């Protein structure tokens, strides 16, 4: 009798362990590089994570004529959250923090790929209030090719991001006077 | 009773598991090549995808002797989808944009290997109206040896796609007085 | 009752999936080594398939003292078709085009390898006209060692096929006054 | 009878033995790099584990410029523990020890990684009651970028944790005159 | 009641493909070393199988002091048949032709190792008819360490074969007046 | 009737060649690193195994200015047992014997990794009475960091134990006038 | 009823594919060095083999001063039979023929290793009477270390064989003047 | 009725198999280094086995300065013997034979490593007693450090074992009136 509900179980979990093996091997990840041409000298890197995480710290600070390359990832395990997170970092040349945001879903019938940058006045943490600013009311990015933007306080960035699920995100923080990369 | 319903349950869910590894399995990419003699600097690199992605950004922009090199794929898991997609460029020098279009299918029954490539007035983001342009309006080609076409504003191209379904796409963009290479 | 029908199946999709696993291992090639010695230079290089495809282009064109090197395969899955095409360059400094033709079947109880080579008047796509040609109408070599034949307008060739089923064809294209390599 | 009690025994053992590989294969690590801008020779490497160990001893002793590399880790076999200690040195040109103290959970749904730093009078080993100290006193670090405090007696330290499971911990401990590296 | 005639069904099927897999991994080859010590050039390198096939081709001619290195193997699959062939050279300085013939049988019970060598009048072809000539006709030698024999027109060769299934085939062509190597 | 007992056999086999696979499986050794600063040539060196075996021998003599190193391990197959021994040699300049002693467990919920060294008045090969006198009389040290204590005879050691269970045992003996490395 | 009757075959298939993949996958082989310090050039390499092949040739000759290294195995699938052959060369300085012979067997609960060498009377070629002599008549040596004897006409051998299964035979052929390596 | 006593030989089967691989895989092996510091040139190496064999065959003869490397081990397949051996070495300058012993058993629960060295009077070859007087007349050593004995004529040894079951044996013979290494 409880044999083949035994049985049940058997298709029941055969059925399970496929659907978290899969939810466990789809991969999401960012290769974020932020490249510092803007003449001046970036410091106490930040970061915060809607989703996902990094296996690696930021750079403390990014001399003129360096880059950011960052790597952060999905959560391991069958989490079936995206990679969706912001970096920070102060500039005291000019009084602001500098902010980047990406976002590279898990699940791409409701979501895609989108990234943003954008100044701040005074010394900041990166939080959920800078995710919500980049993600929602400053216009992010589609990864649909390169894009330009000016900051203000005389600085411009050039960006593009890869719009597959193990996105390249490439910005250039350059000078207003300067030609994108 | 109910057990041999289950063993009906059991022979679904193979022939199913083993369709959806296949889907998944089957790749589909472009490698493809544009290479720039026009004299002319490019920029602004866009794309457009109607079928696939990509893990890699344009170059931002390609001054003359340069290549564009792009990897654009199928999209992992069991999607049924090929490559398809635009990669367009400004052309700042003749007030123009060059846009390069590629087609490699999932299914070889009802389609085959296309390309085009054609200049469009002014700065355009690359979009559907300029793949239905490239693909049904503008007479692409087959992916059955080399092929060359003016653009018309001193420029030619000659280009030819392998016609396998993990296919290369050469493109050499030249000034119409120069021997193809 | 229609539990052995099950089991029934079962004998049927594990006979059928190892067929279809036999079909998609089985591979077929050709490596097409084509070699000008002739003097003139070739251009715009044209290929037809009948079965199979090519993961690479043909070069654009082939100065003298340079080799094509072209590696035609079977389709990928459980095909049953081999490899046969055509590669076809114009030669301006005769008005003629240069076609090479080769077959490397599926089906060795009914079919063996097949090469040939011609010149046509004037530029022309590869076709299945010059297919039908080639290997019904202008006499083919079998895959026996080493042959040789003039083309007319001062020219000749000497090439040979192995007669495997990853077969390689080897053509040397020479002026009438030289010794085959 | 029995037969299928044997069943629910196998459906039992199976469940707990994926269970067991599952505890086993998570793996938990810190890599914590203290880096010795201090001006001060440090010995005497003291270390205390909560949760995990190390496959390496500390150096003995961390002179002017070099950094301490330690690499603590989860225990093996499905012990469901992070990782969690103190790593200490005195310092005799002060009379004090720097005690470095990192949290890296097995469980993110109730815990997440933390950092601290702070000297203690005297030459003291690190045990329970600096861990203590450190984690719940002394107001620790979230993993979420770069972080500076003093730590009195003219030393300070800037550092980070990454906020990942596999998570680096790097401290530069620095004079007070120093700009973080 | 038939479904025990599929368990009879399933026990003919297990034991055929285990056949089919012990015919095609079973693997027959000769590796073919000919030196041509002989003070002429063999030109227009011709084959004939009997059984098995090559992946290369002969070289077109052999000039003095060098070598023909070639491949010969079973054909793929569980075919159940040996390396059985001849390789045929012209040598226009003497007006004749060089063939060598191997044979490398499938079954051993029955079969051994068989190679000779001969030359024959004019220019020809390797056919059936050198084949029959050779193994049968002209007394071949056994794979049983080194032999050496006269050709005529001032030509001798010395060679050996291996006994084995994989069999190597070294034959050096000399002049008459030369020492073996 | 007895079917179903042979199934309970099954199950009793299985679960104990996965007890025998995992005792087997469990790794424990000892890097045993002692490290002769002493000023004093040491000679003829002895072992002594509570637990456990190595697959290499001790130097003979170890000079001033260099290091046993010795890699102590677990017997092989499901013993569950750990490395417990002791390695001692004679230093005829002072006419005593320097032995040390290591402990790395097989079972942490009732041990620890414990280490010791002394030295013993006139020649004496390494034995139970010295593990004895090393593990219970002479206090050792635990796995929790580096120790320093004095020999007598002017010589001094310094040390420290890796806790986990491959543990890297490192020592410095030395005269009574130098600074642990 | 006959369904336990094809349990029953299945039981018998079992136990002969374990028998046959046992007897397949047993490895014999002889590594046969012989050493020409002679004084004397060998000529004309011949082999006999009673049990099992070699994958490639004897050296033609052997000038004074260089070896034969000579590879014989067993026959490969489920043979059952060892290794056992001679091989022998004509030595024109003297006007006899060196032998050499061998015995690796597959059965060493009746067999064992066993190797000799002596000369003959005038060129002849390796065979059975050969081996009869060297294996009977001529009183072989043991696989027991090295041996030494006089050939007659000036030489001496020494030699020795591994005992193994997959022994080194290493023969010393010398002037009966000179010391054995 | 007889079907489960099939089950029955299956169970047994299944045990056997498990035994006959673990026995198998079991490795005992020695490596046998024995170091010439004598003075004296030693010459024909012989060799017995008790257990096991070895794949290479003993030096001819061992000058003043170099080592024999010897690598003995276990039969192949489940034989349930360990390697037992005499190695024996002439030595003319004083007329007697160096042996060396060395026992590395299966059995571990009965029998441990032991080694022994010995000159005998006038050429011998190793045999059975020779291990006899080493392993029981001549008080051999265990594998517990380093152990130094005379061997009379003026020559003494070193040497010491391993005691796991892959040994290392190492042995230095020397003159009386030299330190061991
Ligand atoms: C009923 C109403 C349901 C509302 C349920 C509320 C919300 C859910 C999703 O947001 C989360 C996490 O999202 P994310 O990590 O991918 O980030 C991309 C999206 N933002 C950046 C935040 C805009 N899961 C997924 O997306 C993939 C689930 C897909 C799992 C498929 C199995
Ligand atoms: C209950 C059912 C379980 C549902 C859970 C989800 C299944 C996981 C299936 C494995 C999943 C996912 C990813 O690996 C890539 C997407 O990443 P990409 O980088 O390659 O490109 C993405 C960028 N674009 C989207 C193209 C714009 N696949 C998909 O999105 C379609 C999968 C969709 C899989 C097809 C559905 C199966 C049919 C039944
Ligand atoms: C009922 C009417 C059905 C109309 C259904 C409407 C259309 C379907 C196809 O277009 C899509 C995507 O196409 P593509 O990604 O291959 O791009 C090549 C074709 N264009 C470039 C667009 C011209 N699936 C496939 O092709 C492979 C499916 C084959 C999956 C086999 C399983
Ligand atoms: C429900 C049935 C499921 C249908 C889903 C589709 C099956 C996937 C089967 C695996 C499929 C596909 C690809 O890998 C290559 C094509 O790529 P190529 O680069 O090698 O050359 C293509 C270029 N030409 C076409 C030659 C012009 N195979 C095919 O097209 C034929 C497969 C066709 C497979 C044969 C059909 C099986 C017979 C029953
Ligand atoms: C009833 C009448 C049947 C007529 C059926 C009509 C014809 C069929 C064959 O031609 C095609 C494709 O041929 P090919 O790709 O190998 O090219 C070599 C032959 N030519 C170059 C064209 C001369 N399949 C095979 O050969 C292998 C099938 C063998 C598949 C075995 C499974
Ligand atoms: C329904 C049955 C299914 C039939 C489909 C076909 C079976 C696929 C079996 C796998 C097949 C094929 C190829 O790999 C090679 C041929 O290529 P080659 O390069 O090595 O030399 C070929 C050149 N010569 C022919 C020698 C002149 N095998 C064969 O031709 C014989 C296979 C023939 C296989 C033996 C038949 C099995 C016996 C029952
Ligand atoms: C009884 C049930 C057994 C429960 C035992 C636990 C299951 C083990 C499942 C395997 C587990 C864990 C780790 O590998 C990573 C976390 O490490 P990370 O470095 O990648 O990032 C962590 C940092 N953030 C958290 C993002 C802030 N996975 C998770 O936390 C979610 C797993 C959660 C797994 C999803 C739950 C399955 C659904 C049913
Ligand atoms: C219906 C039965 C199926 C019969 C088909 C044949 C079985 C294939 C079994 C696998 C077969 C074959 C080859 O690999 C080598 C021969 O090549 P070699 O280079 O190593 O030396 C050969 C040169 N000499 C012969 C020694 C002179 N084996 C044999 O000949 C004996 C195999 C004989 C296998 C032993 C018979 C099994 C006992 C029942
Ligand atoms: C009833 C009373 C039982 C008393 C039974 C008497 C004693 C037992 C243990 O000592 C032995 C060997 O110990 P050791 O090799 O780990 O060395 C560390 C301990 N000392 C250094 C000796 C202090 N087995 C284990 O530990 C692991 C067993 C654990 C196996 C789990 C399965
Ligand atoms: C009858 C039951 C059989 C019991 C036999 C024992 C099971 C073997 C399970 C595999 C075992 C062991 C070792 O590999 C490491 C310890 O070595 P380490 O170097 O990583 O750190 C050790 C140092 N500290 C202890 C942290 C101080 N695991 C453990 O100790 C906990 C295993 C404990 C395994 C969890 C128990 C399973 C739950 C049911
Ligand atoms: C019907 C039964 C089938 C019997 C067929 C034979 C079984 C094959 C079993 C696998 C066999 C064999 C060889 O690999 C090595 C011998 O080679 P060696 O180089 O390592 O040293 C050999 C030199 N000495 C002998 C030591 C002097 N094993 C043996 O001889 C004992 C095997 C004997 C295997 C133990 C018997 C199993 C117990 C039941
Ligand atoms: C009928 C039963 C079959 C019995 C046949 C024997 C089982 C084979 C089991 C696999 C066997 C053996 C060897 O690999 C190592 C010994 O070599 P070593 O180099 O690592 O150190 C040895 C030196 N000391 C001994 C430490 C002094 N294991 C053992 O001795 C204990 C195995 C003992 C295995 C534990 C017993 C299982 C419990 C039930």
């Known amino acids: 009798a409880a044999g083949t ?3 049940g179980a058997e298709l029941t979990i055969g059925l399970l362990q496929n659907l978290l093996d899969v939810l ?3 991969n999401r990840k960012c290769a974020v590089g932020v490249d510092n041409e803007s003449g001046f000298r970036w410091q106490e890197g930040s970061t915060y994570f809607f989703s996902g995480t990094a296996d690696e710290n930021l750079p403390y600070s990014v001399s ?3 880059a950011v390359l960052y790597g952060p990832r999905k959560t391991n395990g069958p989490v079936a959250t995206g990679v969706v997170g912001v970096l ?4 005291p040349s000019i009084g602001k923090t500098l902010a980047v945001m990406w976002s590279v879903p898990f699940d791409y019938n409701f979501y895609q790929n ?3 940058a ?5 010394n900041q943490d990166a939080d959920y209030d800078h995710y919500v600013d980049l993600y929602y009311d400053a216009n992010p990015f589609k990864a649909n090719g390169w894009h330009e933007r000016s900051l203000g306080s005389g600085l411009k960035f050039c960006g ?4 597959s699920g193990q996105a390249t995100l490439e910005i250039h ?4 006077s300067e030609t994108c990369m």
Chains 1, 2, 3, 4, 5, 6, 7, 8 share one sequence.
């Open 118 to 122: 954008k100044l701040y006045s005074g």
């Open 5 to 7: 509900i035994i049985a």
């Open 64 to 66: 003129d004529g360096y």
């Open 160 to 163: 593009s991001m890869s719009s």
């Open 173 to 176: 923080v350059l000078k207003e």
């Open 24 to 26: 466990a091997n789809v």
């Open 114 to 116: 989108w990234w943003n």
């Open 88 to 91: 920070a970092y102060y500039i």
